[PDB]
Ligand binder design. Sequence first.
Ligand code: RXF
Ligand code: RXF
Lengths: 196, 188
Amino acid sequence: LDKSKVINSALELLNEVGIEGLTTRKLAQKLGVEQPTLYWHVKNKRALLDAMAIEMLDRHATHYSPLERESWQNFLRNNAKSMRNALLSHRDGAKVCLGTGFTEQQYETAENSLAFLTQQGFSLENALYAMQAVGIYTLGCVLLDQELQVAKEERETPTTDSMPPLVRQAVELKDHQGAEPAFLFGLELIIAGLEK
Amino acid sequence: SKVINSALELLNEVGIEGLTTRKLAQKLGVEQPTLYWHVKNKRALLDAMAIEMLDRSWQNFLRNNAKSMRNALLSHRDGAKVCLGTGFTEQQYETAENSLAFLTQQGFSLENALYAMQAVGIYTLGCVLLDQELQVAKEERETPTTDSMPPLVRQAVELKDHQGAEPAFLFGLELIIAGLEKQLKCES
Ligand SMILES: CCOc1nc(NC)nc(NC(=O)NS(=O)(=O)c2ccccc2C(=O)OC)n1
Ligand SMILES: CCOc1nc(NC)nc(NC(=O)NS(=O)(=O)c2ccccc2C(=O)OC)n1
């Protein structure tokens, strides 16, 4: 068994049953092998999520060097949008990818993101803090979105006379404008802050 | 109310995924049916815990709200996961209107009041989710050896593992507040 098959199968299985439902019983069933073969090539669930995480992110990343022109603003801006699509590409993607940024498998990506940023003048400390901020905001909005959809089912439909006025004008607004304008609004905030 | 204080300590004992109304009653003593009168399901339970956690110059308003949210979510296990997406639940109508009210007072459009509060909120929440996740996961993951890291990684990881989290949080926090000063000063 090659690592590649193990992980593509784990992803198909992630869509089917979710991060919580991802057992070694089921992954083996899918790969058509006995479980000791699987424990031969993956230990704990955490090693599996780490490899899924970088595959997920890899699929959505451009495999070119940057343009040579590019500004740090655009580089952060596409990085953010690329990450968003990766997180939205699979059930529970955000839950998978949280905390993977400085695992072994993203040492390559992180070195290149740090390099570019210092390339364009960021001290090492501002690059770290810039990437992390942009990283977690993106992952956060995707988590929040998942939740609002799952939660609206488990709570009584709300009455719009019981709201105060500004809160009504506001509920309606979020509902109507959807998910993405919020995300891009925050991403533009962080980048403007960075211009300094 | 003592319903809730109880629920809070069951959280720290057993974490959000072990928190069930079965286990709450079993621990309260009462039977299930006495408890539904207080709390209908696991969601409403969470909704009621969330205000308990959070209760207990426009720039400085956003900053203190932020720091205050953070302290609340860090006070209890999976605090961040309890509170996510509770901002416009019934129990928070009062807090919200207030913040929306005061923010429009100072020449924020309501539309930007909303995207202001909500950006600061999901970033603060996310920092705490992140912190809470790195703790659990360092149990499950091999010691990273620094000679297997590339150079700029080594620097960044040394730094992080020395300066802690608050700096990272406050820095991002300032990039938002700073970017809002620059959004208000590009409309009026
Ligand atoms: C050594 C402590 O510093 C540390 N260690 C780890 N893992 C050991 N992970 C992080 N950060 C993140 O994983 N952040 S993240 O928002 O959730 C993210 C997810 C996916 C891809 C990138 C990021 C990201 O933005 O990476 C900055 N930080
Ligand atoms: C029109 C539905 O929109 C909607 N509805 C709900 N509940 C119905 N909650 C949200 N947002 C959040 O809960 N965001 S939050 O980051 O997790 C947060 C947590 C705790 C306290 C505040 C916030 C926050 O900053 O609220 C602005 N949004």
